[PDB]
Enzyme design. Structure first.
Site, PDB file in Angstrom:
ATOM      1  N   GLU A 283       0.874  -1.161   0.000  1.00 51.36           N
ATOM      2  CA  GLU A 283       0.000   0.000   0.000  1.00 51.36           C
ATOM      3  C   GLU A 283       0.918   1.218   0.000  1.00 51.36           C
ATOM      4  O   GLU A 283       1.613   1.484   0.987  1.00 51.36           O
ATOM      5  CB  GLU A 283      -0.939  -0.006   1.215  1.00 51.36           C
ATOM      6  CG  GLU A 283      -2.074  -1.009   1.141  1.00 51.36           C
ATOM      7  CD  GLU A 283      -1.605  -2.466   1.324  1.00 51.36           C
ATOM      8  OE1 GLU A 283      -0.858  -2.739   2.319  1.00 51.36           O
ATOM      9  OE2 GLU A 283      -1.981  -3.368   0.472  1.00 51.36           O
ATOM     10  N   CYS A 317      -2.224   8.652   3.272  1.00 54.38           N
ATOM     11  CA  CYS A 317      -1.861   8.148   1.959  1.00 54.38           C
ATOM     12  C   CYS A 317      -2.894   8.549   0.906  1.00 54.38           C
ATOM     13  O   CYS A 317      -2.540   8.899  -0.213  1.00 54.38           O
ATOM     14  CB  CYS A 317      -1.703   6.633   1.999  1.00 54.38           C
ATOM     15  SG  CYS A 317      -3.190   5.742   2.432  1.00 54.38           S
TER      16      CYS A 317
END
Ligand code: NA
Ligand code: NA
Lengths: 511, 496
Positions: A283, A317
């Site tokens: 990720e 993120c």
């Protein structure tokens, strides 16, 4: 005469905020890693400082692990998977233990929030109501999967084999030993996201928390022991990414690496994994767009755009770091977003008034301010914010940049701080082109109440999660992860469970 | 003089070309490579030798076909219909495809027809039925931190995009089908790179794909070397996924290239699959099972049962029988219906396989059957059974990929488990027994992606296949492969 400058800073009259006794006790005592059945220092004796980003002071020290310590942790996790009681535990045992752990997190939620606020810098109220609450729920949600992992029974045609008598099925086995490396932006919550699915499936885990935020993971180690997990099922090693992290990634005795962080570091990790044919979940970076259609309520949209970027000081993120707003409403939305930005209360995370904490480290402030300076250098201008703030904490103003173009570094590159770039568009095809004009593909949002437009748009945006009238909103039942250079694999939901298992097909000829 | 269909002869006689978008094309360089019939070492055809320029053109076409062509807006039922047509076309031309495969690869034409071709057709038919049945999920989100939430949340399964597919020489048409069919069912487009040793059936499949009505650029086929064409495909940043079957070593190289572009990967790699025989077996059934497990397709099978571990109570009787089976197998050209063992695919393969055998002799292994060289044209090797081997020997540790068995005794099941798992690989395994308790205690303990019982290397389109450990990751076939050709997108709407 010569100019003499004085930066106005009074740490001396600076206000303080009460801490729980438990929090104080945890901070005061010596910290160790959890390696198999023991709490341990590093073989070298070396330690690293833990810094409170609100004031730059050292609040704790933790071990600085090298390859030797990581290898010991991996050896313990291997033993726990290959031979301990965890190997023969019933699905219902794993379920029970995980449920106990979720309750223990909830029982100690304020202390965990204080630790997280002191170590990471985020507002304690948000740490408590989001991070800690959702860490607990992640363990509880996954606990329920422990008894519900199902393979398939297949009715094989066997078309080339007459009168076949074949019994065929799949088993889902734990992938094995999981190395988990996590970032500093949601330390406890990300630990939960990696550990919970591992426990539910019967894996064992070596966790490497970020060097900047080791404390909540260590406290979670205590709760894991208190919940009754067998020794070596969870091991926790503290230290630098370039030493401890790298060593974990290269160990051929792990079966899976689970990593969240930058795309650049993710590639390094993946190349190490590949050389051992270690499975990988990654990720990685993002530059998520926020698309505002012209039918919105202007205040709702502006609050949505502001929240999408400034949540957790932009250290997210999927931060909504590029806003594309239809030209009919661009000026009104941006005017409102700048007012919101300038109104946000900047301060220490332990102050309940604080809406924007400091960034996690000096290095992060250096990076973020370097990006802002770069934007100015290329012709962008600040509708709000733009500097570093004096004093010893790592504070930066919520910043909104306009007059940006797709060629600028601030638009192309992940900043990972409270910096928005905002631009107009005249039609939806153009908004789609702009939104997909990134190597990334982690998240995106659309702001509208137009059913037709929303459903035409959702399929066209190349992102792992597309939100409508919200952004960076999580639920344990909804998988999360990247497309394109944002990585591959999914966190949360039924999906992550399957990704911590390895499928074995079985085919028996009983003729 | 074994007869060939007129269609097979016409295909062999005419110029061969790659399929690149809307054109059949030769390579920009003008280079070609020879296609050799391994039964006699003669050149039967020539195909283009693609370089990076030709691969880039194929990738560009696949990109266009996914991003803007009619394939992008095709209905699930359109993809289903076209795939079903293709499956029927394969079946309608099955004998010709079998002859091509036998001439190019070397395997018995009867096996090519009844297994490879039949199962290639069935793969397209099975996967056609998934095209209308790919489902996302609707999630009832708790949103525990958000009071009175009004959230509508779900997942979409989207095609992963453009797929680069690189395949080995041992089941050329069947492996092409495995990589292409799930791509078509999910709405992907594909650039296929067949093995340099076996290009021909893939090119004929290209013709059938066009005849079925697939839009141009949905499938592209580029011939040439792994080190040039294959490598170029793997590094192209415009592919979204790489799907590779081959050696672990090459798989890593491919994966490193993929990773630099964050290309998704599926890797089906090497194997050294064990065959475990328990002492309750019928000796003839077990022996026949052990022999089939290794000598099927001349041992050129990723899951070949290359290590046999047989309980000491029945070791001698089983191996006696296996050696007799080995020595009895009819070695000959694949086009002869009497042939049970064809040649290996190339001279380089024969050199490798004989070098392994030699290595075994050098370390103290002895041949219970075979071992001895076969004179004459073609790349023939005897079915070979080695005994007195140990776990330290190269022949036991390393994948040979030919008709070479190593066979060792064991005294108890714990030992059989230790021995069976003593490999970096984990692709397949089998257990031979009728003992329910023993079987069910053993299946969980063997670290392989497929565990067969009283059979080996048996396939079905509904049952996923792939590796554990150094045998790779990802799965072919079944519902599993379909999910692996999609990318999941979560959608969360606040409708408050
Ligand atoms: Na810290
Ligand atoms: Na050939």
């Amino acid at each position: 005469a010569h100019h003499h400058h004085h930066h106005m800073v009074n740490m001396e009259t600076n206000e303080t905020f009460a801490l729980l006794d438990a929090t104080r006790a945890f901070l005061a005592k010596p910290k160790q890693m959890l390696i198999g059945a023991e709490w341990s220092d590093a073989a070298s004796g070396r330690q690293l400082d833990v810094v409170n980003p609100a004031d730059g002071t050292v609040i704790a020290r933790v071990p600085e692990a090298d390859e030797r310590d990581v290898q010991q942790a991996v050896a313990a996790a291997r033993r726990a998977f290959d031979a301990g009681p965890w190997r023969t535990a019933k699905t219902t045992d794993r379920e029970r233990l995980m449920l106990v752990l979720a309750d223990l997190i909830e029982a100690n939620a304020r202390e965990l929030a204080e630790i997280e606020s002191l170590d990471n810098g985020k507002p304690v109220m948000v740490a408590q109501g989001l991070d800690v609450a959702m860490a607990a729920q992640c363990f509880r949600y996954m606990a329920g999967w422990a008894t519900k992992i199902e393979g398939s029974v297949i009715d094989a045609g066997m078309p080339y084999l007459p009168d076949s008598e074949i019994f065929a099925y799949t088993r889902k086995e734990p992938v094995g030993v999981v190395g988990a490396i996590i970032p500093w932006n949601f330390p406890l919550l990300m630990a939960a996201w990696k550990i919970a699915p591992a426990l539910a499936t019967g894996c064992t885990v070596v966790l490497k928390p970020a060097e900047d935020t080791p404390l909540s993971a260590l406290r979670l180690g205590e709760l894991i022991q208190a919940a009754g997990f067998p020794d070596g099922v969870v091991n926790i090693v503290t230290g630098y990414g370039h030493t401890a992290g790298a060593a974990l990634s290269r160990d051929p005795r792990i079966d899976k690496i689970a990593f969240t962080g930058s795309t650049q570091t993710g590639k390094t990790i993946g190349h190490a994994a590949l050389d051992n044919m270690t499975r990988m979940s990654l990720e990685l970076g993002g530059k998520s767009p926020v698309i505002v259609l012209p039918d919105v309520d202007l205040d709702k949209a502006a609050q949505g755009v502001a929240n999408a970027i400034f949540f957790n000081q932009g250290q997210v993120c999927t931060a909504g770091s590029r806003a594309y707003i239809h030209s009919k409403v661009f000026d009104g939305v941006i005017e409102r977003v700048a007012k919101i930005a300038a109104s946000l209360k900047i301060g220490p995370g332990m102050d309940p008034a604080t809406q924007i904490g400091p960034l996690v480290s000096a290095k992060q402030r250096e990076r973020v301010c370097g990006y802002i300076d770069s934007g100015f250098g290329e012709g962008a201008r600040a509708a709000a914010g733009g500097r570093a703030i004096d004093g010893p904490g790592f504070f930066v103003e919520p910043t909104v940049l306009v007059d940006t173009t797709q060629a600028m570094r601030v638009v192309r590159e992940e900043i990972f701080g409270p910096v928005l770039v905002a631009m107009p568009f005249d039609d939806v095809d153009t908004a789609v082109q702009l939104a997909n004009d990134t190597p990334y593909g982690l998240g995106a949002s659309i702001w509208s109440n137009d059913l037709s437009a929303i459903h035409k748009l959702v399929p066209r945006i190349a992102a792992g999660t597309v939100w409508v009238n919200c952004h960076s909103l999580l639920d344990n039942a909804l998988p999360f992860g990247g497309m394109k250079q944002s990585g591959f694999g999914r966190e949360l939901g039924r999906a992550v469970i399957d990704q911590y298992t390895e499928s074995k097909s079985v085919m028996m000829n009983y003729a």
